[PDB]
Antibody
Framework: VQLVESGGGLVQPGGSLRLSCAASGYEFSRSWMNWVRQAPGKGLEWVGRIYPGDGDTQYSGKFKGRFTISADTSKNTAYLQMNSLRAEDTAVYYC?????????????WGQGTLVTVSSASTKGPSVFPLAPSGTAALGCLVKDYFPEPVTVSWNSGALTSGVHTFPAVLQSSGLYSLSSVVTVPSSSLGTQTYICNVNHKPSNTKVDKRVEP | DIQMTQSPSSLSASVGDRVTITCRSSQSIVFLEWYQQKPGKAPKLLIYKVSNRFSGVPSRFSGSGSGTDFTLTISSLQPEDFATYYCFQGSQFPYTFGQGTKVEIKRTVAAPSVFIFPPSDEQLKSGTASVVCLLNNFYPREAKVQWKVDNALQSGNSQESVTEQDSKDSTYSLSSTLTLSKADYEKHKVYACEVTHQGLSSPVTKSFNRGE
């Protein structure tokens, strides 16, 4: 049993976006499918649900005006069409099956898909070394990218111990920035090469940055 | 319409501790459930219909209550039980979640290791100077980072980021980034981040001299 959300991305305020929820491994039509969202760092918020067997929908009144939930039982898929998006609609959107007619609600969840509503445009990060000066610290500054997410690896994934990739923080420019750091033996700085591999999928940006003492 | 209020909003408990989280509904709902959400993960159903453990949930989790007052109990907190816990009511439309209770692991005090990183020449050539101060593997979470530029305390030109508690050693790390224009950066020599933490007897200062 699996649920997979798709369609999340960057949308300008006032724009629209349709998300999808592909179900697998169970009779999709005879269980309610819910949409639940979670703004970054905030709580869970129930959006609404549909019974795919007959198309019956139920919305939290907050979204009844501009959100529309639908389902295609021939595709085992549910949809969330969102209109007139605002910045406060930025969230990870989950789809979740419930069994509310029996004993419990959300027993199966998808991984979630991120919807960012912002006037900021897609932009790949600049990558700058954080140069080391019996343990040393070094890293990479991953600055001025949008939207989330980015990934950082070290030495093409061969270096994982002691790595801290910090949560992105929104700058006053409306762009994200973070650092990824790692602690290593100071005796290794002369003979060990350290490279951060940065990937920002939304902009197709891939950057390898050699970090030298 | 139905308001779900959890108490406390946050808690740090030691492994082995008895943990109790309460959920208070603004109206009687006599379908109360408890969900557990790891950072960066989807929520997982823990308790359903007030007191029933979902399949696979360890016996240390238990739920109780009635009417408007409900309690999630962890009889012996385990290292893998750190999460944000949400209560949820499915009795009255529209269905609502509690605001969440973030449970983190209380461990022994560890003072941060401090490092400072000057801006790169590559970034400077673009007209901006980012100075980064790193506080590594510390507990508890509270710490203060003060930027001093030629011994002048800075304000309004730095941003901090703190990691989620490490799943293995239960520590935090913190980054503080000082951002200056290239012109402002070139006007000063000494760049220092001064760190305090309850595990530090005296502030830790890491500094560099511009262009050295």
């Amino acid at each position: 049993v699996q649920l997979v959300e798709s369609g999340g991305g960057l949308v300008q305020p006032g724009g629209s976006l349709r998300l999808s929820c592909a179900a697998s491994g169970y009779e999709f039509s005879r269980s309610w499918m819910n949409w639940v969202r979670q703004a970054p760092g905030k709580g869970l918020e129930w959006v609404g649900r549909i019974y795919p067997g007959d198309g019956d929908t139920q919305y939290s009144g907050k979204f009844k005006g501009r959100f529309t939930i639908s389902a295609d039982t021939s595709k085992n898929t549910a949809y969330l069409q969102m209109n007139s998006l605002r910045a406060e609609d930025t969230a990870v959107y989950y789809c979740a099956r419930d069994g509310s007619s029996w004993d419990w609600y959300f027993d199966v969840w998808g991984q979630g898909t991120l919807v960012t509503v912002s006037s900021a445009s897609t932009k790949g990060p600049s990558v700058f070394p954080l140069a080391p000066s019996g343990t040393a610290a070094l890293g990479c500054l991953v600055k001025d990218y949008f939207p989330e997410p980015v990934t950082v690896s070290w030495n093409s994934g061969a270096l994982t111990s002691g790595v801290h990739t910090f949560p992105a923080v929104l700058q006053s420019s409306g762009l994200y920035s973070l650092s990824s750091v790692v602690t290593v033996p100071s005796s290794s700085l002369g003979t060990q090469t350290y490279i951060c591999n940065v990937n920002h999928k939304p902009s197709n940006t891939k950057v390898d940055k050699r970090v030298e003492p | 319409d139905i308001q779900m209020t959890q108490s406390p909003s946050s808690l740090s408990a030691s492994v082995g501790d008895r943990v109790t989280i309460t959920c208070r509904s603004s109206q009687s709902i006599v379908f109360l459930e408890w969900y557990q959400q790891k950072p960066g993960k989807a929520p997982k159903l823990l308790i359903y219909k007030v007191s029933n453990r979902f399949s696979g949930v360890p016996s240390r989790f238990s739920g109780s209550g009635s009417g408007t007052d409900f309690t999630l109990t962890i009889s012996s907190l385990q290292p893998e039980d750190f999460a944000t816990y949400y209560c949820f009511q499915g009795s009255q439309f529209p269905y609502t979640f509690g605001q969440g209770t973030k449970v983190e692991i209380k461990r022994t005090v560890a003072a941060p290791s401090v490092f400072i990183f000057p801006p790169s020449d590559e970034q400077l050539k673009s007209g901006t100077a980012s100075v980064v101060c790193l506080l590594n593997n510390f507990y508890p979470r509270e710490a203060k980072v003060q930027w001093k530029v030629d011994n002048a305390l800075q304000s309004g030109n730095s941003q901090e980021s703190v990691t989620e508690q490490d799943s293995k050693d239960s520590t935090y790390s913190l980054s503080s980034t000082l951002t200056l224009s290239k012109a402002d950066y070139e006007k000063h020599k000494v760049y220092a981040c001064e760190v305090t933490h309850q595990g530090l007897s005296s502030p830790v200062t890491k500094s560099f001299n511009r262009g050295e």
